[PDB]
Amino acid sequence: MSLQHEKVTIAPLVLLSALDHYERTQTKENKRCVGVILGDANSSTIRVTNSFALPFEEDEKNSDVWFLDHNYIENMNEMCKKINAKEKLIGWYHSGPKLRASDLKINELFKKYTQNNPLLLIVDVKQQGVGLPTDAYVAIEQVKDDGTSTEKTFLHLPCTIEAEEAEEIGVEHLLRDVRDQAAGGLSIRLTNQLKSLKGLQSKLKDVVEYLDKVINKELPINHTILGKLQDVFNLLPNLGTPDDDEIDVENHDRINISNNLQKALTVKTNDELMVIYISNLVRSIIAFDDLIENKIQNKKIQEQ
Template sequence: MDVIKTQQISWRAIEKVIVHPLVLLSIVDNYNRIARDTRKRVIGVLLGSSFKGTVDVTNSYSLPFEEDDKDPSIWFLDHNYHESMLAMFKRINAKEHVVGWYSTGPKLRENDLDVHGLFHEYVPNPVLVIIDVQPKELGIPSKAYYTVEEVKENATQKSQKVFVHVHSEIAAHEVEEIGVEHLLRDVKDTTINTLATEVIGKLSALKGLDARLREIRGYLDLVIDGKLPLNHEILYHLQDMFNLLPNLNVGELIKAFSVKTNDMMLVIYLSSLIRSVIALHNLINNKMLNKEHEKAEDAKLTAIPAEAGC
């Protein structure tokens, strides 16, 4: 029995896919409006730029898409809508071009290769980014793929394209970070706060800090090894940052931090008590108003038979 081996004939052109927060927010909003609480998935076009193997996804828009659950080969995508949207986006920002498409999966499907083939008309090597709109665990909610062609050593079999996983990450410009932070602050309900949300928020913040510190360390290691040129501006900023760090070995500073933390916790505790008292006060007032309203209604009902008897 002959064992058929395969080999990839396309070189690894894409090394990393960077997804911006605006894209994630747009995809989640589109999913909630179209396919929430259903088994349908949402797909759309990814816009951005590519440079030296890195695909930077900065924008997106959804597409009208339908598929048969029983027969994956039956599906429909509105090409006219896609062409119209692409023309309008080019008028707004000519630097953004089609880099691929997205799907809310949450996994690869049989007809994804057919849909992927449509985007070869717009970009030589498009990417597919699957966004998990309902993640069950912490981590990056996106997975990126691109296609390579596999050729069988057995000449009787034809070559075929397959998806290959590529590293993806979430990144944003400073302006985007500020905008997303304010947006999430407005969306979040400050009246509802649990220990779980506090722990998740603290864990996310610590992970972000750890990533930034690792990035700084990696840069300094490359500079020491001579793989990157010395940039005095970056070193000045790092030195300023280190100079601003407090010296935690001083006893007076530790005591000051403790006093400050206790004062802040006391204010939070008092605020929670005041909010609870106000809520209880409003509840009592509401019950009193309802009771007075019921008495007024009963008085009206008793007054009507008396008038009828007269």
């Protein structure tokens, strides 16, 4: 086991299969697809190569009643290693459509197999967000007192992608899109800035509603959670101070440069104008030669 995993990058193919698998097993809500996750780990970069389905039946009358095909897993692990050896058991996906408190009973079964802590990929399968609907959680074990002595909990890690030559081009090939998660050109970064503001408002409601539910729908007072919230307010900017003033001076510098840079562009655009009128100048001499040839051609027409 290792807790050294700071990012998870997931191939397009892993996402696409697990999602694809949900309707190939023809499961609907409250029945689960789970599959084996194969890839690299023991490193900071997790690189998620492939995945394959398992059968999974969930009974939720008792969360101690579960179906898992044990034998299937061992068999399949060995065959995959003969195509490519870099495939190891690095976890299992859960098909969502939300997190539970119940995913921890299941996680224990996968610690058994592995030499890293199993990655629990909650792939939300109706697909909500203008971002990815894929969460990564790795079970981390640390001594902590919040009413417990030793806690196993799941820490979120970022989900992003990485792709091969072949795989990237195959994505692009499906897509008729030019992307907009890129943050390349001016146009693209404009779109992004507005998406960022909308991302921020929606999360703030989720924080605002959570707090209404303690105090009026009576969940318990969780010191540890609030504690974290408190610091948000403590590390706020405060204006009407010289700090606010340094910003004003900053604005001036950048907008000056935009003007001076723009004035360069006023020469560029204007210079070109003269060059076209040169091309128009040349085209009239050429058209004159044509007009002479065509004078002669008309006499032939009369003649014949």
